[model samples]
Target: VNSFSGYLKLTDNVYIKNADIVEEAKKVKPTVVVNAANVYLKHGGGVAGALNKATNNAMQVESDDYIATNGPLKVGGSCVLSGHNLAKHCLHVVGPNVNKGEDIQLLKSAYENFNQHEVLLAPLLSAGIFGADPIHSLRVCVDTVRTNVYLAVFDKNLYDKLVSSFL
Candidate 1:
């Protein structure tokens, strides 16, 4: 078991052999995978970026070709939000970046989308959205969007709830 605790950039068209997670995933068949980067708490596009990558990684697991991709979701829209989400387009809540506060921007987007009926947010990245502390962010996202059609990515345990609300 390799433990990685840091942030690394994704390389284009090439796998980063240095990342312990990537190295281990390639060695065997993995059912559920979690790749953590310190960027989650760094702010300024930190959580936003992390959410994008993590969401994309989670999305990779649900891929039809997971067993054959040779790697996880290839990053970006290639996996997470790819293929139209199949579950209400997968609510993507991008928190404000530290400098630009994209995190709040993402939050507002979710709220607007919810109120306007644009689409439901089935948040898959909320687990860390609030913060690495877990409990607070989980509480904030879940408490805020329960009745609405959105699902907090942080607290993904309520998958059935979001799925049922799917259009």
Candidate 2:
């Protein structure tokens, strides 16, 4: 299992860390776990990649099913999948790719859709492969997550920087 060196509190109930997100997800036992995906809900890379592997590619199957039934997915939109390994529900959201600031709202939108959920596990949505600003991505998640939320940060250096500035 992955261990966190320390934790930074972003809010009363939100935290950031350097640890395996899936391990954190399991530890939290949240009602829903959020996965950062493309517009089509494809689990391409970053948090989605880790989540996809942990769940045995469950998100991919779910994404494919959603696209087959619902047509093309809109960017920033969210899709929910049940019976996932990490959480009862997995909230897959489309966020902006690198250099595209316009779609950051999509992350907010995706998070908003899961407001009713008791707890949510999330990561820095567009910060990885999408090349989004990590701090800004964290801001979006922090602003949007109305309920209890956990944000797993795999990069130790980034985690340290965030804690230094925010805590």
Candidate 3:
């Protein structure tokens, strides 16, 4: 897709956040399926929040890999309410609210569209898994990668040494 700015043409000053993101994600296309979400949701609140963040982080892991493959998978949104998500072919599963079966179903559907080979470079949190004892979450994420796809820890050297493992 031809990128354009001011008048369907690149501008010298316009912010190219999305455009840059698209460009940076054009290689891993043929063989990769990443997720950037956690086991559940933690950014929201409560137990569901934990699950939500975990799941979000896991999905985010996938998204990062996918994006590296072919632009951002632009996940996040209401699926059951209005199908939407990110991917070479994304799908929104809805939730971070209630239920589980549907979420699993949505993920199952999403997986069907992924390429299982290529290295999946994924981090725990959107950037860094927040909160204390986050390493526990990292372990869970690592286990997930072992079970699902290969997960690459993110921002390792960006912080402290001992803490970098979780980054």
Candidate 4:
């Protein structure tokens, strides 16, 4: 398949790109950009922190404020907030912890909420601090996704690996 605008189209409405998630999220301006967030929506590290930095630390403030007002976000749920800079909005989802015995059901929940959004930009949910493997992470995404999505990662090697396996 041919690449377009930095994305390699994998299957219908499924795409992958070699770019910083924050950068690609802004460039694509998808209806919702995902933050692989903790249950508390803490923006200490990983994609959450990067997104916060991208938005001039405003995302962290917003995340904390939202939680403070609405209570902590729970497992297998998502919440949306206004995005900043070049982004329109952000969807914060709590990915399952593999070591803690949380299973695929929780993981699939993240992709399921995506249907309400027309376009989505996300990373491999739970593939970071939660310790999910990329292959299984992608499998859950492919099996459950219901809208146009772009999987963005900062590492070119990861992008190349996914292309080789997927294409």
Considering every candidate listed, which one attains the maximal lDDT?
4
Alpha carbon lDDT at 154, candidate 1: 31
What's the residue-level lDDT of 67 in candidate 2? 86
Stretches off by above 4 angstroms in model 1 are 1-85, 88-90, 97-113, 117-121, 124-126, 129-131, 149-167
List of clashing residue pairs for candidate 2: none
Query: How do the residues 72-143 of candidate 2 rate in per-residue lDDT, one tens digit apiece?
Result: 666666777873768778877677776665556566765666576666677777777888778877777777
TM-score of every model versus the real structure:
0.28, 0.83, 0.29, 0.89
**Which candidate, 1 or 4, would have the higher TM-score against the true structure?**
4
lDDT of 4 by residue, 1-167 (tens): 32227677777877878888887777667667888887788888888888888888888888888989899877778898877774688888888878677875788886776767878888888876678877677878888887888888677887677677763
Q: How would you encode candidate 1's per-residue C-alpha lDDT over 1-167 as one tens digit per residue?
A: 22222212122111112222222333322332322212222212332344334445454344335435434321111122332212323323333333433353243333332332322323323234344223333334443432333222332343333333433
lDDT of 3 by residue, 1-167 (tens): 22222211112211111122112223333123233332331124322233224344554454445446654222222111110122242222221112322232233233322233223322232223223233443443343332333223323343233243432
Candidate lDDT (C-alpha), each: 0.31, 0.72, 0.29, 0.79
TM-score (C-alpha, index-matched) for candidate 2: 0.83
What's the CA RMSD of model 4 in angstroms?
2.7
Best first by lDDT, ranked: 4, 2, 1, 3
Candidate 4's displacement at residue 29, Å, is 2.9
Of candidate 4, the 10-residue stretch with the lowest lDDT total is 1-10
The TM-score leader among the candidates is: 4
